[PDB]
Design a protein around this ligand. Structure first.
Ligand SMILES: Nc1ncnc2c1ncn2[C@@H]1O[C@H](COP(=O)(O)OP(=O)(O)OP(=O)(O)O)[C@@H](O)[C@H]1O
Ligand SMILES: Nc1ncnc2c1ncn2[C@@H]1O[C@H](COP(=O)(O)OP(=O)(O)OP(=O)(O)O)[C@@H](O)[C@H]1O
Ligand SMILES: Nc1ncnc2c1ncn2[C@@H]1O[C@H](COP(=O)(O)OP(=O)(O)OP(=O)(O)O)[C@@H](O)[C@H]1O
Ligand SMILES: O=C(O)/C=C/C(=O)O
Ligand SMILES: O=C(O)/C=C/C(=O)O
Ligand SMILES: O=C([O-])C(=O)[O-]
Ligand SMILES: O=C([O-])C(=O)[O-]
Ligand SMILES: O=C([O-])C(=O)[O-]
Ligand SMILES: [Mn+2]
Ligand SMILES: [Mn+2]
Ligand SMILES: [Mn+2]
Lengths: 554, 554, 554
């Protein structure tokens, strides 16, 4: 392997080992003299990194440093991430990745990923053909319209697919060279970016004409034409309107899913499932109120229904336990604000009185669970939280909007205002909370990073062609089944983040077993031990020998 | 022409333009899609850099950032340096480069330059053959034994040749692809480094056996075998003993000089020549006392003698005006401490009383000029400075040792203690000094950076075979002739550092004319207008077109 | 889209177009000046070739010239073959390819294919990894022990897999870059080659120990490990013993078949099927006698049985109609010479009298069909042919051994000696025969070239995993079904060789339809129109544009 020799082996982060290149590799591959005499181990290199990181102060500075390593020594980059994924997650992922995107054009050094603009319409294939890797298996694509809860960040949104894919590898051991981050640039409506001299995209408002849909269509076709019709394509951070219609339009034709609708749905469900274990509350007494009625809300709601239905409840009965409150208020039949086909099943006859605020909604409906997915800030006010604590003995409060500043409420607020009776989870990380009575609560992170890595690995290994909703239901069950009784008592609704790697692999195994049982896997020969197969297929951050095969002839 | 296309053009800092690649270049060279849709100008890129630099706090942090750009986008790296060489010089050069060196193994990211170790003895040519560039014209090599005034830093000393060559380009417009930084590693005697797990060299004490001389010989031969007998080889930061030995051994065989002996000699002389003009002092009344008697002292003294001789004094008369005081004391006939052949000419009959300290030496000898070049710290104590001010109306005080902490004294000390009557210069940069009467004094920097760039350019363009001392005498005159009377009154002993680029080119022009007039140039045909020739040959930081020549046939 | 520019595009035969590179391609790809100013069309190039070929005299000289083009301009090479496949077939294939193999080491210029020797045991994967093409779909491998009817030619046998693969492309439009010729070198028993200074293989007798089987196993594993478990592997020219055991050993584990046993079996049957339509003979009256009882005889006999079975006869009944006569005589129960399990079904109770010669066998058994497949020369003597003509009104005589000198008899001999009453076919080409009465007979060529190209294409496009005998039965029917009534009357037992391209495609079409109907195809999505799918997938000899995609941005 490795056709290149000389300087090019050092210039390419995929092969570059720095001083880890052995003496023999250096002499045989023409590197002797190009590196200091010192021969180092990956351990020493990782030590050098941690030593430097410790001296840094701002999260963004740390983000620039670690992400920079991905462009110098890929193996080391993942070794570093794997050394302590929990402490680096907030840096490479939410919330810092949100900060990085808002200033993407200012911290730019080297480009990452594939960029496809509306000005390239009709020539996307040639762009796809310029990507250096021939064996792409997974794609995470965004158009930058709904970056987390930050809004339209245009091409600055590329930091998201890059980050997601980094996690594909770090969490599920998916091969880096088989991952392709993609940014579709059709312009941006963010006035600030349009006047930013460092903006990385086209200086035009978003093209919302038929050319937009045609470009996306060309994208889907170009990607599958070169890499295969089963190439995994994960849509990420697309605006509400486009997110749904593209999922419906392509889910039966391509191997695709939307992380914000389906991935977030699975993590949220998983958390709810864990809470049900600690509370043992009757599915009939469940009253769920959503703050928001978009990608996440509808995604989570539908998965919840699927769960209730396979648990002895009719689809209609299940849907009736779910209410939604968007920017215009409670979704009730006959309201002024629009209601599409997706929201209809959750739009019920108006209650006795109509609420004006989410607080009114909580007091009127008396929900047992409250889920925040509006990406609009601290909407779960202290009064909202108190109401939930007065109405329920153990209220379930989920503040899922990212990044942190967009979260509906903090762990501190939830645990304190509910006297430690709530079951809380958030999308962005919060440290443990200690109440005056000495009890310490460790908030879980209901973020899709717990789901897309394992699901991606299973789909890829099984050569799955299409992803049904039932696949996410299974992932949700696979995630929650990994929680130990001790962890439940700790108030943890999700396995510890420090164990994300093994958790993701286990989810992968559980999903592959599900795919095979339901004829959705197409690999030959079919491995007898699915668990062993998945584990044997994972990419390792350990250095590989680049030495040519030299041997004696008799 | 460019033989590479695709990703490789972006991975090679020599060609990479970042978003400055034009639409045509991207499409024709297979980069479309690998870069953000945005097309930027070098101006915007430079702005991004300055914007980020401004937000940084420590010099070392800045060093890491700017030097990192040399490995990402070479054109931008030099553009950045050219925008404000005066404010960046302290970061990429002394004193920060000294700090960078001391922690080279800790800040390591990518290797820079060629490394040749004693363990590679007998295989140096193969290492030289690994260097990617085929047209090397200049080499700056060190063995790291005498890095500035910091001592033995071993392989960590590579930062020096790297910095020096960055200046070849930034100051004289010498092509970067024609420069080769070299570090000779024969071990190190620095105990701390030998126990440092991040050390970049062989873990052994310096090899001072015949094998050392043999290795250097192999180095000289290998470099010239591949690149040519006239390849410029600048020895830098070698220990005292080796420095002279190798200069004497190779100067008539190769195109080589020692920056620390000759380069420093020329800049120091230039300072003295400038002082000459501000105070109109008679060479007969010139009494010079050196603090130190090594590489710099001997180099400077020899050049000063050549200057006085050329001005009507006999070699003997001139040498009689020069005294040296090393770590053992005053160099006087019959002293216990050793006196070699180089020092003999400046070793006079012991005076009335023998001084214990440099202060005593000043009071006993009553020198009019004091030159600090002992690389040992603040040896020009407040009392030494006062003595010079009491003995002389306008004392000349030079504290040339680098980095800053090793300087004999600060500019503030010099100007205040002499009540603004001294003519001061230092190797390391000091800001302007304001006395209590409100007078402002701007200290000049007598650092060889004002000399080696211009001399290198001339020697390279003229294909000069060997460098005589007279070439440095000329460079010294060329440097000082650049000062305007206006500047002289401002305390200026050297042209503004902000004008280092034009100063170097002009020095390059004067030296080339000197080389031709003395049959030391071998270029043909001989250009009629030397100034025009030199200016046309300089490398520019502006991006070049990478477009293939496409055109219609008739 | 190509990743190479400059001279390399010309040095690589896959991309080199010679003077066919357009002006724009030359200017944009950096070829301007490297080619004569002239811009040519493939037509002109093909004209130049035919002009030169016409002036050549010996077939071997022509072989060297045409095969040389495969290493200079691949597109042109196939254009040339496609221009007149019928007149060149005798040159690149049998009989000339046999002559080329006999002196392969003497005409050597450039290597073709992958070579794996017993001395590489344990390192086969590294060899396989050295092959430049990443998407191999088909492999033709030989160990050179049974090269045609020429015997053990060792590494000189490489000429066979190379020729077979040229035909994969020329006849079925299979992509050249997806084909891999392989020679397994375990030594050779050919004493003449062991003393030949130009031999291209290991100088040792064949290794017949366990190491041989292990090397073949490593080969199979290595190829599939790198290219996929469904990679088509066509065994070619292996010795009798090895041919069968490897087919039995791997046919259910890998996608593999043996051309000599199965390919030849299908062509033969095809001819017999055609003959049955010209003479309308009831197979209860067909008595078949084989001259030989090896790879071809057993392969043909087995397919014949399968054909009679699906046509209303029991396996027992069908086998009884088949007799075989090898180098020891008639295969009869209780004979001295060995009879293995494959021959047992065709070994019957000795007849009234036991024949000494094949002639005696003909007179005693009175067969209606005689199939020569002993690779031992003119065993179908004039007396043998006369006997078949006196015993049968329309005797079927097949002389299938290659090359020409090994054929059991010529077309001239068969037609003349049977007074034009025989239905004849041969493995090697013979010109038309005109009898004294003016009748002209055109002998058909029952060579596997009519089968492997079409079968290979179907198996590749259908991602078939294993090849059953039924596939060859279908291929045989597909071949004969293409004969037109007018061609039957001509004495044609096979479609004209000049139409082998379309004949191969139609066979491929029929075989894929058969694969789908029998759940042996694994392609997604499944094309609705198989015929259209196959034809659209074929590689074309027309030059492709190598121009980068250049366009204007709005
Ligand atoms: N101030 C608000 N109060 C209540 N609901 C709001 C408010 N602001 C926005 N929303 C609702 O939040 C929903 C956001 O939907 P959208 O599809 O844009 O994102 P999402 O994926 O659901 O959110 P996130 O990814 O941040 O969890 C919308 O239904 C919107 O009406
Ligand atoms: N403490 C001291 N007091 C006086 N002289 C000193 C003292 N320490 C060192 N020296 C002298 O300084 C000289 C250093 O010479 P060396 O060749 O090592 O370096 P250099 O190139 O002259 O110095 P630099 O590059 O720092 O200007 C020696 O002659 C040494 O004796
Ligand atoms: N002189 C001969 N007379 C009759 N039979 C012979 C004679 N010489 C060889 N044979 C037989 O021909 C058969 C050759 O079988 P083998 O497997 O070696 O090759 P094949 O593939 O059948 O033939 P071909 O090389 O023609 O395709 C053997 O059964 C052998 O006994
Ligand atoms: O430790 C190393 O070798 C590399 C560090 C980096 O690329 O930052
Ligand atoms: O401004 C740029 O495009 C590059 C910046 C860097 O390499 O730091
Ligand atoms: O969009 C988000 O907030 C996410 O994916 O976590
Ligand atoms: O050694 C030094 O201080 C220098 O070269 O400037
Ligand atoms: O072996 C043969 O004779 C053949 O393949 O045609
Ligand atoms: Mn998202
Ligand atoms: Mn120096
Ligand atoms: Mn064959």
């Amino acid at each position: 392997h490795i056709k290149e020799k000389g300087k090019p082996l050092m210039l390419n982060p995929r092969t570059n080992k720095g001083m880890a290149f052995t003496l023999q590799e250096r002499q045989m591959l023409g590197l002797q003299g190009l590196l200091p005499p010192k021969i180092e181990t990956q351990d020493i290199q990782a030590l050098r990194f941690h030593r430097n990181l410790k001296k840094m102060t701002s999260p963004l500075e740390k983000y620039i440093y670690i992400m920079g390593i991905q462009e110098r020594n890929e193996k080391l980059f993942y070794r570093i991430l794997q050394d302590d994924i929990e402490s680096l997650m907030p840096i490479v992922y939410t919330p810092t990745v949100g900060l990085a995107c808002s200033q993407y054009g200012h911290i730019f050094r080297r480009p990452k990923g594939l960029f496809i603009s509306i000005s390239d319409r009709g020539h996307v294939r040639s762009i796809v053909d310029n990507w250096p890797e021939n064996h792409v298996k997974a794609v995470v694509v965004t158009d930058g319209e709904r970056i987390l809860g930050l809004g339209d960040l245009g091409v600055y949104g590329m930091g998201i697919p890059v980050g997601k894919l980094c996690l594909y590898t770090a969490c599920a051991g998916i091969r880096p060279d088989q991952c392709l981050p993609v940014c579709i640039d059709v312009g941006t409506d963010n006035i600030a970016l349009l006047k930013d001299p460092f903006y990385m995209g086209l200086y035009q408002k978003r093209d919302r004409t038929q050319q937009y849909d045609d470009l996306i269509d060309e994208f889907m076709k170009a990607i599958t034409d070169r890499y295969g019709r089963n190439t995994l394509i994960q849509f990420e951070d697309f605006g509400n309107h486009n997110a749904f219609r593209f999922l419906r339009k392509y889910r039966e034709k391509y191997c695709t899913f939307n992380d914000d609708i389906q991935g977030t749905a699975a993590v949220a469900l998983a958390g709810l499932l864990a809470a049900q274990k600690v509370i043992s509350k009757p599915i009939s007494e469940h009253k769920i109120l959503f703050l928001g009625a978009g990608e996440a809300a509808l995604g989570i709601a539908n998965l919840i229904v699927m769960s209730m239905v396979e648990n002895g409840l009719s689809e209609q009965e299940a849907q009736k336990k779910i209410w939604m409150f968007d920017k215009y208020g409670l979704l009730v039949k006959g309201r002024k604000a629009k209601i599409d086909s997706y929201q209809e099943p959750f739009t019920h006859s108006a209650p006795e009185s109509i609420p004006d605020t989410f607080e009114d909604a909580v007091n009127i409906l008396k929900p047992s669970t409250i889920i925040g997915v509006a990406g609009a800030g601290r909407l779960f006010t202290p009064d909202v939280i108190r109401a939930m604590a007065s109405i329920n003995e153990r209220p379930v409060i989920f503040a899922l909007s990212n990044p942190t500043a967009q979260a509906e409420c903090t762990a501190e607020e939830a645990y304190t205002l509910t006297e430690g009776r709530c079951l809380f989870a958030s999308g962005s990380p919060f440290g443990p909370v200690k109440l005056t009575d000495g009890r310490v609560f460790t908030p879980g992170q209901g973020n899709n990073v717990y789901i897309f890595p394992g699901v991606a690995l299973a789909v890829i290994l099984c050569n799955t062609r299409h992803i049904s909703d039932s696949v996410f239901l299974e992932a949700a069950k696979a995630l929650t089944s990994q929680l130990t009784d001790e962890e439940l008592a700790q108030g943890r609704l999700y396995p510890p983040l420090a164990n994300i790697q093994e958790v993701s692999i286990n989810i992968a195994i559980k999903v592959t077993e599900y795919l095979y049982a339901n004829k959705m896997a197409f690999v030959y020969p079919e491995p007898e031990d699915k668990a062993k197969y998945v584990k044997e297929q994972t990419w390792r951050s350990e250095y590989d020998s680049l030495l040519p095969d030299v041997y004696e002839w008799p």
